[PDB]
Amino acid sequence: QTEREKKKKILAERRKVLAIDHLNEDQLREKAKELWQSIYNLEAEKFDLQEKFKQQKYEINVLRNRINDNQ
């Protein structure tokens, strides 16, 4: 590493110690459930965006045909 990599690696570790390091086993069980539901929500929103991407290419391809066919 160097220093702007050092700075990135250190500040990201500081992000965990600020939100996790002052918690006990029960206070931090709740933190894990809370952090997991955020993952479930962002993975869902990604899947919804993944399927829209599979569809926009079909719409783009048919628009590619209609321009190809109407000139």
Binding site: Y58, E59, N61, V62, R64, N65, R66, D69, N70
Partner: protein
């Protein structure tokens, strides 16, 4: 579009073809040849609201005058009466459902799969002419634009 109207008259119960015949023979009182000129039609137009010019009145006639008389008879009157009584966002999604191979077009056998999954006993002439009416450029397939003009008037 057009043959959605012609199809609508053939489905008119004789209850409705007695309504229209009764009204049509009211229309053509005073007319000598028993048909609707602009004299006859302008009467019923002032009877409800407006007063068009004797060429706006000859544009409603020539829109359904298929025998070239300048007048409307009863069989043409029925076409006049069904005209007087989905979207591109809906149709685009359903277009994708015909296009199973997802190439952007609806070829013959993709129609037949759809037709043969409809519950009816699909005859060849059914396939033969739904392909004939839908596809207008004759490249053996229904593209997007042709599919829109092919479902125009289908609820």
């Amino acid at each position: 579009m057009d043959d959605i109207y012609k199809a609508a008259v053939e489905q008119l119960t004789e209850e409705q073809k007695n309504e229209f015949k009764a009204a049509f023979d009211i229309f053509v009182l005073g007319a000598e040849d028993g048909s609707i000129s602009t004299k006859e039609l302008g009467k019923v137009m002032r009877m409800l609201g407006q007063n068009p010019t004797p060429e706006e009145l000859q544009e409603m006639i020539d829109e359904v005058d298929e025998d070239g008389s300048g007048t409307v008879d009863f069989d043409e009157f029925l076409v006049m009466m069904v005209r007087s009584m989905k979207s591109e966002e809906e149709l685009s999604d359903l277009f994708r459902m015909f296009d199973k191979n997802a190439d952007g077009y609806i070829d013959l056998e993709e129609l037949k799969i759809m037709l043969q999954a409809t519950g009816e006993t699909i005859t060849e002439d059914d396939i033969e002419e739904l392909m004939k009416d839908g596809d207008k450029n004759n490249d053996g397939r229904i593209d997007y634009d042709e599919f829109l003009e092919f479902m125009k008037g289908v609820e």
